[PDB]
The first five atom37 places (N, CA, C, CB, O) and aatype in JSON, in Angstrom:
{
  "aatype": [20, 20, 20, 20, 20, 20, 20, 20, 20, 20, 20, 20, 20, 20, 20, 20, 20, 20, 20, 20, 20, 20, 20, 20, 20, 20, 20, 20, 20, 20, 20, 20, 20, 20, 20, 20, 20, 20, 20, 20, 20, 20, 20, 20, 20, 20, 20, 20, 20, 20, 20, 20, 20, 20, 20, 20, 20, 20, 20, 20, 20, 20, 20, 20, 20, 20, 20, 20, 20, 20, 20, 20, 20, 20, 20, 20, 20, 20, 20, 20, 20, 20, 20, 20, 20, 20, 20, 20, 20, 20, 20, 20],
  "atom_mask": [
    [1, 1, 1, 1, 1],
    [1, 1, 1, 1, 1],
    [1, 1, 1, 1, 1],
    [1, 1, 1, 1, 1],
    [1, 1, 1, 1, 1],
    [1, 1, 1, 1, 1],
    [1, 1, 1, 1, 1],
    [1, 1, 1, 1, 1],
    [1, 1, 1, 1, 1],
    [1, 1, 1, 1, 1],
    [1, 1, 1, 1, 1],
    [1, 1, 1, 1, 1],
    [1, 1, 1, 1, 1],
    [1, 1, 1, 1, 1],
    [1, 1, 1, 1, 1],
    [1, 1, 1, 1, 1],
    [1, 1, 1, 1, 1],
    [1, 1, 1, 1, 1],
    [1, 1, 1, 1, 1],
    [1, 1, 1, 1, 1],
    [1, 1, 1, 1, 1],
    [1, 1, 1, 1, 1],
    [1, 1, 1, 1, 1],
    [1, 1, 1, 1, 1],
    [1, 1, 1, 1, 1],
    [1, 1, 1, 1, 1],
    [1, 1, 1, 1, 1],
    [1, 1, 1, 1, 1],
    [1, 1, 1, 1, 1],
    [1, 1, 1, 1, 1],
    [1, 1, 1, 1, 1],
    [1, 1, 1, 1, 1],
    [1, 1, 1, 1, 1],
    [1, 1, 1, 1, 1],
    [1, 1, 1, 1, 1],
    [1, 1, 1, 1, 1],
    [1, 1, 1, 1, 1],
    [1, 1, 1, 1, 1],
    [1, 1, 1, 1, 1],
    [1, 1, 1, 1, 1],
    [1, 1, 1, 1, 1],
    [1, 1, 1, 1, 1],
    [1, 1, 1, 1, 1],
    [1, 1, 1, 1, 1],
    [1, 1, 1, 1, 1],
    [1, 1, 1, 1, 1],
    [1, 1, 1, 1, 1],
    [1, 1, 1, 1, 1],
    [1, 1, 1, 1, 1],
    [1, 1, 1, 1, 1],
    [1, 1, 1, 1, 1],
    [1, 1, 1, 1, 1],
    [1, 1, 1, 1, 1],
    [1, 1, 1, 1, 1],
    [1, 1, 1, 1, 1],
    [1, 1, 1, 1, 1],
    [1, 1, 1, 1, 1],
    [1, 1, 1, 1, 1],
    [1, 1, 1, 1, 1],
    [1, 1, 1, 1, 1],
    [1, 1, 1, 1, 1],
    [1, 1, 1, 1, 1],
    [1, 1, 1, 1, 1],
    [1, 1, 1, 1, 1],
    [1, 1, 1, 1, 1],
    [1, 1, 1, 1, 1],
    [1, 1, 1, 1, 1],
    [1, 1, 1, 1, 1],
    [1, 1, 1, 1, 1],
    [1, 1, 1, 1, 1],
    [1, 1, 1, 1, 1],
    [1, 1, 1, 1, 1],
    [1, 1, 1, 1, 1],
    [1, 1, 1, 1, 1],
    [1, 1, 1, 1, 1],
    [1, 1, 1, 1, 1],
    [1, 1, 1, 1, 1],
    [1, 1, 1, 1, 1],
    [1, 1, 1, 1, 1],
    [1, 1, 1, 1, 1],
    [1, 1, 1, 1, 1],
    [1, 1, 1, 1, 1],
    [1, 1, 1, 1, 1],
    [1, 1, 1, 1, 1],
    [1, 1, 1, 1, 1],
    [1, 1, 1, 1, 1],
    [1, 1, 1, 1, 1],
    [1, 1, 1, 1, 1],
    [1, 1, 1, 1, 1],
    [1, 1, 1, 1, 1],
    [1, 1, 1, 1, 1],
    [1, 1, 1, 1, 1]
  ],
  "atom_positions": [
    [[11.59, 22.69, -11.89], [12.11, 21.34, -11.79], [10.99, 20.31, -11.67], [13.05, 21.23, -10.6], [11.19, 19.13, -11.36]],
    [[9.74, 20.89, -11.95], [8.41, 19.59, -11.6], [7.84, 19.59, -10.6], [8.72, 18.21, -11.51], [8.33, 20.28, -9.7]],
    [[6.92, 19.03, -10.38], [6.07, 18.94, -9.45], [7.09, 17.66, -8.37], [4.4, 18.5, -10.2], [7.37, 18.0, -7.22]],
    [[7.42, 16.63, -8.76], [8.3, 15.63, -7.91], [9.49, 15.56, -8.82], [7.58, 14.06, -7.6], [9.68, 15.88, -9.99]],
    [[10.24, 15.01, -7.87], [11.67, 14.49, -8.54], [11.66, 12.39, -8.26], [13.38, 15.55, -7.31], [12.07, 11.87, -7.23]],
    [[11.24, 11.8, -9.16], [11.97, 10.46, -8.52], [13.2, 9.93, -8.66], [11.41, 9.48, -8.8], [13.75, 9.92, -9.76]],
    [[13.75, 9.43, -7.58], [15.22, 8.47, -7.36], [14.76, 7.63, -7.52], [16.11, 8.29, -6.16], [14.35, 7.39, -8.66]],
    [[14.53, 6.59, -6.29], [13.79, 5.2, -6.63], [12.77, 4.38, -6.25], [14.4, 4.48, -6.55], [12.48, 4.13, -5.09]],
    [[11.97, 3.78, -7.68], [10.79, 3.65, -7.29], [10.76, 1.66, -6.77], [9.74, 4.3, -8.72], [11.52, 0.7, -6.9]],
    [[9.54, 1.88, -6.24], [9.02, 0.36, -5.58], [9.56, -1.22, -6.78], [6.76, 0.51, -5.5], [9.67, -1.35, -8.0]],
    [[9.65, -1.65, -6.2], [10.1, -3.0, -6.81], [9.12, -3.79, -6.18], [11.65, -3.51, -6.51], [8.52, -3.38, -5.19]],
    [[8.84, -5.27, -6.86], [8.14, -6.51, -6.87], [8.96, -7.22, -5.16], [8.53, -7.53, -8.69], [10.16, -7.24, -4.88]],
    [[7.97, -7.65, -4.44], [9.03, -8.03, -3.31], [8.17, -9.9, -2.99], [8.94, -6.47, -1.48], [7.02, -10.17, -3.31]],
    [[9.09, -10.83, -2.35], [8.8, -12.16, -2.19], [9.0, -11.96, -0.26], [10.03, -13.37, -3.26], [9.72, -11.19, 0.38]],
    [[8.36, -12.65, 0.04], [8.49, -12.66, 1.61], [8.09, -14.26, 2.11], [7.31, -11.39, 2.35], [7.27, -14.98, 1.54]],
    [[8.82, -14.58, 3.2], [8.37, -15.71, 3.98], [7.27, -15.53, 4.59], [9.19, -16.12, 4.87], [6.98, -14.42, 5.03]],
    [[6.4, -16.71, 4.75], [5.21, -16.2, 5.22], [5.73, -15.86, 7.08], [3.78, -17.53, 4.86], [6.68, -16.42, 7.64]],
    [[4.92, -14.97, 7.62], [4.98, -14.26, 9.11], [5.94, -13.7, 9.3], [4.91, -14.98, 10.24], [6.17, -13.43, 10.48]],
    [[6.73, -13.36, 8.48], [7.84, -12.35, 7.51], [7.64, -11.03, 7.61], [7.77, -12.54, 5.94], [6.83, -10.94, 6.69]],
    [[7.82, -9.33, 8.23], [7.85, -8.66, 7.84], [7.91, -8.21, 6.36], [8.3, -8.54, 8.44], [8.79, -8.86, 5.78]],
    [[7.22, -7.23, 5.44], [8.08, -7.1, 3.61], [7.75, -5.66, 3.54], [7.22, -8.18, 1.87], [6.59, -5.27, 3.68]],
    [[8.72, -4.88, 3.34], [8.67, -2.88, 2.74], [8.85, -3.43, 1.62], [10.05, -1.36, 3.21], [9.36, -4.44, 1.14]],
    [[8.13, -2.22, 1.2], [8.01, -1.57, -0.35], [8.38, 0.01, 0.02], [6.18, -1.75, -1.17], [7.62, 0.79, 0.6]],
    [[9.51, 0.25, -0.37], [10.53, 1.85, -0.41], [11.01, 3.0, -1.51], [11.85, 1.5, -0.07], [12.0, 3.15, -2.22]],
    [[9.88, 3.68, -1.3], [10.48, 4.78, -2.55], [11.01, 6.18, -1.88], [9.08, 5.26, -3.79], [10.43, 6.89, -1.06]],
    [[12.23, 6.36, -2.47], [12.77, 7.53, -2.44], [12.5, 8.41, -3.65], [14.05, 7.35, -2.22], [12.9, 8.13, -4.78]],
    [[11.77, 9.54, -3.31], [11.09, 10.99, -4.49], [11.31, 12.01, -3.28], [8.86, 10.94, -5.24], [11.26, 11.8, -2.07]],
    [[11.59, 13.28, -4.05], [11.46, 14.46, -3.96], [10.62, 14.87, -3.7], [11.68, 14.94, -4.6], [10.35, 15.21, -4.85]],
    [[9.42, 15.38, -2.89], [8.45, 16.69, -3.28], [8.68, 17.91, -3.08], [7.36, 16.71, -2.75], [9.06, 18.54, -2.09]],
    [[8.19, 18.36, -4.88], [8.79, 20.24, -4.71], [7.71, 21.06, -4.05], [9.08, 21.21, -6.44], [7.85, 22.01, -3.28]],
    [[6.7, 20.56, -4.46], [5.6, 21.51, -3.78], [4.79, 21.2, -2.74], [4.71, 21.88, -4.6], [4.24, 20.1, -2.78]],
    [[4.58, 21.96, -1.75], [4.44, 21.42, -0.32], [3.05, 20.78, -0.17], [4.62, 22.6, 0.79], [2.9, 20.12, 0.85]],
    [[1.62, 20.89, -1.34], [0.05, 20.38, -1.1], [0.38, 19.33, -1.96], [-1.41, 21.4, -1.55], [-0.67, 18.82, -2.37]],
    [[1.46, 18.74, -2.45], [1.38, 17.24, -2.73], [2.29, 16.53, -1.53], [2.0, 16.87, -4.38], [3.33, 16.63, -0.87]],
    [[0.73, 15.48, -1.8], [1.21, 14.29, -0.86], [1.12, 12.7, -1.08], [0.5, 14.46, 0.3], [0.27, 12.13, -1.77]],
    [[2.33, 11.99, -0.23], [2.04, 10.56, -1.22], [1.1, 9.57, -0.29], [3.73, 9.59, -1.66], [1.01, 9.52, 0.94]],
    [[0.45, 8.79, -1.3], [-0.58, 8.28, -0.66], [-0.63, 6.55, -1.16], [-1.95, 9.24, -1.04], [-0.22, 6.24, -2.28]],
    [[-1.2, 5.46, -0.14], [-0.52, 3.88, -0.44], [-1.85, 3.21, -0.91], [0.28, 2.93, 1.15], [-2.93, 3.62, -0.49]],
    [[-1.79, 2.3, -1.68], [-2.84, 1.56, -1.73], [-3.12, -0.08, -1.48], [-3.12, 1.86, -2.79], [-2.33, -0.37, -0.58]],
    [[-3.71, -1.06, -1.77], [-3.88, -2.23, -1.86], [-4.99, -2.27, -2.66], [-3.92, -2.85, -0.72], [-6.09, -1.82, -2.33]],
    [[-4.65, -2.99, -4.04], [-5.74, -2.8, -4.75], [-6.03, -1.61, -5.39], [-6.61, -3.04, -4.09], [-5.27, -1.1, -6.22]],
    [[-7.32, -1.06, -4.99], [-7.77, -0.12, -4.59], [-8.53, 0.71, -3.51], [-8.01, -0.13, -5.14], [-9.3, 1.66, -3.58]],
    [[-7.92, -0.16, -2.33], [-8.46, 0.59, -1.04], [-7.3, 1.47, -0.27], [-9.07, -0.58, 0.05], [-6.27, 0.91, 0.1]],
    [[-7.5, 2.72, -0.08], [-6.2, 3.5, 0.46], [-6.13, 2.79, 1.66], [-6.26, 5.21, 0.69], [-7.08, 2.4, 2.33]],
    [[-4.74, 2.63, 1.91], [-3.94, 2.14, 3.43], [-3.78, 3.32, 4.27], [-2.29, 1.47, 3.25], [-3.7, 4.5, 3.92]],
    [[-3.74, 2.65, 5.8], [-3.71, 3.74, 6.6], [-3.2, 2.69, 7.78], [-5.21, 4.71, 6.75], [-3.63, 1.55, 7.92]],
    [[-1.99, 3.46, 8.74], [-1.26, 2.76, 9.72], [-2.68, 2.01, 10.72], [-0.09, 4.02, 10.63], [-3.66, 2.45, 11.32]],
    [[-2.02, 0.53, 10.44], [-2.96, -0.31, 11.51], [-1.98, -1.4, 12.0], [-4.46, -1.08, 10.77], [-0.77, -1.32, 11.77]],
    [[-2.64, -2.59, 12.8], [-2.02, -3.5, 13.28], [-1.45, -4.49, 12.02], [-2.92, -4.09, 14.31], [-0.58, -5.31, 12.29]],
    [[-1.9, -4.41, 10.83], [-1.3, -4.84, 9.62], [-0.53, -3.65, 8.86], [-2.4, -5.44, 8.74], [0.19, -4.1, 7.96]],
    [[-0.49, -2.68, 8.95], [0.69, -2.09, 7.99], [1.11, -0.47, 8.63], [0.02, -1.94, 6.13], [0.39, 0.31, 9.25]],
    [[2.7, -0.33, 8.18], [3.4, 0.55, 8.94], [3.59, 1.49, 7.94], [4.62, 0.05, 9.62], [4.36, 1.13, 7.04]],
    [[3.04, 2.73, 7.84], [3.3, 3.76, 6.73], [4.23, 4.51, 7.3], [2.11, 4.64, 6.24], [3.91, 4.62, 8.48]],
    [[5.64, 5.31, 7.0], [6.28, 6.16, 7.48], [6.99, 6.89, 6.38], [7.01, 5.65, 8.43], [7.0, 6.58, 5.19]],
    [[7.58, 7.9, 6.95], [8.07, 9.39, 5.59], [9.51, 9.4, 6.58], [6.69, 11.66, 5.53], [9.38, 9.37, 7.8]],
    [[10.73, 9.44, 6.02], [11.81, 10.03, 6.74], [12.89, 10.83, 5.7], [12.52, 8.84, 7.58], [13.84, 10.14, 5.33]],
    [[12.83, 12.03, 5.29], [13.01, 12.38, 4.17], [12.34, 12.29, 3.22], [13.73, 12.08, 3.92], [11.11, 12.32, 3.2]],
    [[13.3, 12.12, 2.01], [12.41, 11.77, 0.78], [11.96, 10.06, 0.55], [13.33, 12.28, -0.59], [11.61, 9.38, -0.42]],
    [[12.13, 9.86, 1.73], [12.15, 8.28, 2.04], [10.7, 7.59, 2.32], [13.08, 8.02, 3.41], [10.52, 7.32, 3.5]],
    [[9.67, 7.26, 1.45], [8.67, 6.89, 1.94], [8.58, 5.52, 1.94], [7.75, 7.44, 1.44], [9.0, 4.83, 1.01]],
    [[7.86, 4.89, 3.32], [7.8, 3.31, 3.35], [6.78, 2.72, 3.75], [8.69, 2.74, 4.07], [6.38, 3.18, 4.82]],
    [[5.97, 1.59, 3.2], [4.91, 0.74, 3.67], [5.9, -0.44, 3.92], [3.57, 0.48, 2.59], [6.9, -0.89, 3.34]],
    [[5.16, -0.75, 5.05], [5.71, -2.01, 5.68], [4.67, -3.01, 6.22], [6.62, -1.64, 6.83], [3.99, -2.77, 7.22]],
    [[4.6, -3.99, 5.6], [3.28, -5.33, 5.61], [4.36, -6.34, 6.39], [2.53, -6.15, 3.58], [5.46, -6.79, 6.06]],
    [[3.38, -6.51, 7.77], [4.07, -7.03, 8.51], [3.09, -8.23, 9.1], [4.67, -6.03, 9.38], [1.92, -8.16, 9.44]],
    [[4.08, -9.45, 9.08], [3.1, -10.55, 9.62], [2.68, -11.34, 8.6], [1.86, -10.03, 10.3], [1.98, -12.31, 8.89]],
    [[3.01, -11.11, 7.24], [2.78, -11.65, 6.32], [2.11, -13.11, 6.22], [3.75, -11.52, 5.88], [2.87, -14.07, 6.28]],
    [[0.64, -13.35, 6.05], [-0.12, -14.33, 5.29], [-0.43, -14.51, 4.06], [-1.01, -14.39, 5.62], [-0.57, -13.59, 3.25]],
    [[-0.6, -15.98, 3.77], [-0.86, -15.7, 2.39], [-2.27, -14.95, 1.45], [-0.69, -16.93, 1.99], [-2.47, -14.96, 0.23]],
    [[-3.11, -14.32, 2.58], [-3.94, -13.49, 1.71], [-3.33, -12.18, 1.75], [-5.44, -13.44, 2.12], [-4.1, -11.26, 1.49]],
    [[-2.17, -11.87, 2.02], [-1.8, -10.21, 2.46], [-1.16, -10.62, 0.98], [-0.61, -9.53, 4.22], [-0.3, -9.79, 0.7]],
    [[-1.32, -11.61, -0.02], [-0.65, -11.22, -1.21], [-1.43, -10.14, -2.23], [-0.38, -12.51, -1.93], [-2.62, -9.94, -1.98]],
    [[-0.95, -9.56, -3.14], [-1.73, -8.8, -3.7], [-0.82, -7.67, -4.2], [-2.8, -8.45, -2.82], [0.32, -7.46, -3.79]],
    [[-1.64, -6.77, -5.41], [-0.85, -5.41, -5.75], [-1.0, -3.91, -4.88], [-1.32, -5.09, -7.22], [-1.99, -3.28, -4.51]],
    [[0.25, -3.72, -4.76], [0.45, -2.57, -3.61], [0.89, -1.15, -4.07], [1.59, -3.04, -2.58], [2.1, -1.03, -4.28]],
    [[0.06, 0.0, -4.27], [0.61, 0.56, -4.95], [0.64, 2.26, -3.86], [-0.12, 0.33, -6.45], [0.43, 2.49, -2.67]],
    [[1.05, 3.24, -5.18], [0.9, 4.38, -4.62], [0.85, 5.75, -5.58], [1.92, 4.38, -3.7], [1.26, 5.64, -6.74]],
    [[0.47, 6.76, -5.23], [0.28, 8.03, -5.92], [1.13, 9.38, -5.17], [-1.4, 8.28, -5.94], [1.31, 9.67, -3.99]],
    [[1.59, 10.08, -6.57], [2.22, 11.02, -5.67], [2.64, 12.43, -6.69], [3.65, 10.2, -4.89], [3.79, 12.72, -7.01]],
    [[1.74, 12.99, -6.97], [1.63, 13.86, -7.71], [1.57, 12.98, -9.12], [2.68, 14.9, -7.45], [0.82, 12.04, -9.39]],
    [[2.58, 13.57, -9.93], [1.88, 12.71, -11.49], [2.95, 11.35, -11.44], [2.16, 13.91, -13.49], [3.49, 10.83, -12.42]],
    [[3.05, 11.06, -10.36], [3.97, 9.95, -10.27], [2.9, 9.04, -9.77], [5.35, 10.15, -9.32], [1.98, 9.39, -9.02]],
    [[3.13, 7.55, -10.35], [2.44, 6.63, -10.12], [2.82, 5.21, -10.08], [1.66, 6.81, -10.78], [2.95, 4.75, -11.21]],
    [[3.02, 4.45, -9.21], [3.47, 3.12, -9.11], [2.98, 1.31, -8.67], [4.24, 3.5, -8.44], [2.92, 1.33, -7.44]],
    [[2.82, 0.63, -8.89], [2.4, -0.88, -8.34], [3.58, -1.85, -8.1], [1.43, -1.65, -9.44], [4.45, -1.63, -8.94]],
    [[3.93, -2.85, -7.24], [4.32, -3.71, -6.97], [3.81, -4.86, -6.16], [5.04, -3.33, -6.75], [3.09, -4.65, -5.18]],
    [[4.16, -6.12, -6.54], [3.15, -7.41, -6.85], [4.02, -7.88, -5.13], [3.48, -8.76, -8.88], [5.24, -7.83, -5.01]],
    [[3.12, -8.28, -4.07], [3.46, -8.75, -3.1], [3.4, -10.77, -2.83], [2.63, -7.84, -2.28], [2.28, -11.26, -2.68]],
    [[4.43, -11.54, -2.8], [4.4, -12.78, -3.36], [4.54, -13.47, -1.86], [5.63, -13.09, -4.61], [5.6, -13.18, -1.31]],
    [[3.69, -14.31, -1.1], [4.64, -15.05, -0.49], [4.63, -16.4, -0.01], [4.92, -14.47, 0.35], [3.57, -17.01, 0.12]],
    [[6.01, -17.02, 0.31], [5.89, -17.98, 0.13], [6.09, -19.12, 1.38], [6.53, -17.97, -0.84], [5.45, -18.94, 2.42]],
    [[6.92, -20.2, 1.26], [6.9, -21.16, 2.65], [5.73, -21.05, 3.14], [7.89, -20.82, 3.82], [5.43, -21.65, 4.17]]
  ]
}
């Protein structure tokens, strides 16, 4: 059945500024040494006082919280041969 299964992937998100904003994908993993991993740009993310990474199921979520307008930018992620970006906008 593949290395992943995807349901659904990340979408483009708009946020108020000092706004919490997730980016949420629901995938499958069939095989247990793949793992999904977040980016900005191209610097890997990792849980800090700016962003909330969590897995609950097949449920994976980054959460950019506090939102300024330099936290705009492309947010992406990897996850076996699955690969995704979404454009973080915000505004007020």
């Amino acid at each position: 059945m593949g290395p992943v299964t995807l349901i659904k992937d990340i979408e483009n998100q708009t946020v108020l500024k000092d706004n919490d904003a997730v980016f949420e994908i629901d995938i499958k993993i069939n095989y247990p040494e793949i793992k999904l991993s977040w980016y900005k740009g191209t610097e890997k993310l990792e849980p800090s006082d700016k962003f909330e990474i969590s897995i609950d199921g097949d449920r994976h979520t980054l959460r950019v919280k506090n939102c300024q307008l330099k936290d705009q930018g492309n947010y992406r992620l990897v996850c076996g041969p699955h690969i995704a970006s979404a454009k973080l906008t915000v505004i007020e």
